[PDB]
């Protein structure tokens, strides 16, 4: 029997238990229509295997060991809501993704993996998946509490120095310089992904777009980011194509923040759609300060520098010089050190629950897989998802 | 998160990790076909297991770890081989049971429950089964060898006298009783099923027939045959109706047993089928011994005593009447330590794959299920059929 139990115990084999587990939960789900029963063989296992399955789905992991505190975003493909694992009394943030709407329509995997590898490394700069469970009609991810908000809210309530601006800069360095070393890229870095923690210190989050690189450290993937206000122009050039780009779409993300944080509207912000994206295209000859907003030439510079070319960018040659840049300079934190120097802004939170750094949100109902005649084998693809800490 | 690891450790439960892997065995050869990968789903989800499917496969127990010495039973549904176990070299029998025959006779189960009851409580009377498995085309049962041929080949090459009718008989009952205190009842008791060991000792095989009780300890159904000869009032009967039978049934077939094994002819033989299940019915009148036969008046009296409606047969109030009847008196052998004692026939056996009490065999077949248009789970019903001590 030798190495059998071995593949089944390692907890990244695709046949571990939570796996076999997913995969007998899934191809019962994907079998109990009335059509599908008609035929003799489908209808005599449901009927043996139907009982103790539902008791296995009692035991497992299910939105019901959580309490819904509040609503804390939402999403598009579900709702970001506080939970408290009634078991455990911890508190934790619980993103919901209806599966169906996941179906973005072409080719997926596997699909995880990303987000396995990121939990797996256990970086501090990246907010942490702890458990990750799924039922029939939604994906779970029960991910560290950040209450402290997202820079979004941040600069919509302050006036951030350029003192501050170094700050949270160096911290999104450092996560990215983290991530990048994991062997991935962002792809979608933005002050929605920028989260901050008890302290005020910053971790980054993927929303699903993170991807893994290859060998010549390029990825070259066909899926999007709608809004492309923090979107590299050689990210936008390849959704039509594919079209490898590098780790360095990530630091042209790093040049907007620092413009947005320092000037109050992004750099090539605009009311359409489309006149942000020609914008961005645009950018050797859009890119402007206000004649007002000052701001030192240090950071006017370092701005210039990861908004161009990707030719020319801050930072293809390896982080180190990024750090060197002269705005970096300070007499409050190392790189060596930041993670525990004092932030800019520590949050007042009262409670373990306290989410006024989150803004309210109303109640929007919910679509999902049409009922199908033959069998189809929505569930399929979420076979391995299943995952505890 | 503390019975559900219960759940699939303990081998009685129906979702341990052999039925898990059945599971998803199952699931990958009703899938993989050229018409169903179409579909995305079904096609990304074969792409990812696959592979590491026909690795289990290959780690699993599988009928190449047997050599096949001898064919020695056939079997509509497919050859009994003498095999050794090549890492063991240990020889068992080997029943194969086509997959494409089971599933047409009949409905449904389960099956092989019997067998699990059966395996698990380990009665020295009862064939033992050892491994159960299967692959795409077969089922596999692994039993022990039983060297000494059936009763059938003994009747045939002895005249058997008393003395030794009384111990047959005497193991026989024992067995049933030991099948019956386990919530079964044979149905199929004949020479046939009873085989001998190295010793000369007997035992009783299932094969396929025996059924679990009521809450009294007598269900109903058919289905069914038994065997012509062999066959009680009350189940040749009961095909609807008012159609129920209990354990009384194979005490029927004791007798019928005992007037073959001293007459030399089954007491209700006839040229027709049609005929003996006539013979049957009419058993208060067709009954009769040649008046030649020489049988002592206990001999009879045990006969007639089995061979009468079930109302008033032997064994109806339980089988510690059967053990005082007038005929089970010797010098031999008491009911407790009648295994322990000196068969009447010892096979002198010159080595362990000696099968000279089974008759050759040949010719030939093979034959499985038509090629699916869409999903229809062939292979279903037998998830969970693998068995391991």
Redesign the interface.
């Known amino acids: 029997?030798?190495?059998?139990e071995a593949?089944?115990r390692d907890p990244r084999s695709?046949?571990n238990?939570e796996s076999?587990?997913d995969?007998?939960n899934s191809?019962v789900l994907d079998?109990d229509f009335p059509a599908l029963r008609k035929?003799?063989?489908?209808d005599?296992?449901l009927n043996?295997?139907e009982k103790?399955?539902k008791?296995?789905r009692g035991?497992?992991?299910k939105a019901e060991d959580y309490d819904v505190v509040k609503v804390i975003g939402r999403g598009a493909f579900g709702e970001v809501q506080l939970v408290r694992h009634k078991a455990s009394q911890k508190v934790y943030a619980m993103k919901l993704l209806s599966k169906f709407e996941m179906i973005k329509r072409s080719?997926?995997?596997?699909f995880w993996e990303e987000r396995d590898i990121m939990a797996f490394a256990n970086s501090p700069w990246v907010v942490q998946l702890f458990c990750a469970f799924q039922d029939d009609k939604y994906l779970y991810m029960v991910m560290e509490y950040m209450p402290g908000g997202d820079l979004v809210n941040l600069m919509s309530n302050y006036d951030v120095p350029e003192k501050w601006a170094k700050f949270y800069t160096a911290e999104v360095v450092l996560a990215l310089d983290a991530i990048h070393s994991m062997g991935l890229i962002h792809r979608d870095v933005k002050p929605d992904n920028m989260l901050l923690d008890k302290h005020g210190h910053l971790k980054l989050a993927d929303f699903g777009t993170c991807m893994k690189m290859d060998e010549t450290g390029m990825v070259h993937c066909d899926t999007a980011v709608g809004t492309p206000d923090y979107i590299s122009p050689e990210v936008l050039k390849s959704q039509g194509g594919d079209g490898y780009y590098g780790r360095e779409c990530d630091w042209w993300s790093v040049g907007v923040f620092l413009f947005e944080m320092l000037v109050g509207d992004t750099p090539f912000y605009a009311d359409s759609l489309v006149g942000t994206y020609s914008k961005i295209m645009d950018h050797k000859n859009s890119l402007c300060f206000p004649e007002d907003a000052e701001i030192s030439k240090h950071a006017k510079n370092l701005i210039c520098a990861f908004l161009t070319d990707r030719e020319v960018r801050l930072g293809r040659n390896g982080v180190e010089e990024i750090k060197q840049h002269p705005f970096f300079k300070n007499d409050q934190w190392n790189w060596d050190n930041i993670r525990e120097t004092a932030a800019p802004v520590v949050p007042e939170l009262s409670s373990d629950i306290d989410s006024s750094n989150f803004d309210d949100i109303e109640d929007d109902d919910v679509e999902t897989f049409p009922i199908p005649k033959?069998?189809?084998?929505?569930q399929?693809?979420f076979?391995?998802f299943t995952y505890?800490r």
Chains 1, 2 share one sequence.
């Open positions: 029997q030798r190495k059998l593949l089944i695709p046949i238990v076999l587990l995969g007998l191809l079998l035929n003799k063989n489908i005599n296992f043996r295997y103790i399955v008791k296995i035991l497992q992991m080719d997926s995997a596997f033959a069998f189809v084998g929505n399929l693809p076979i391995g505890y």
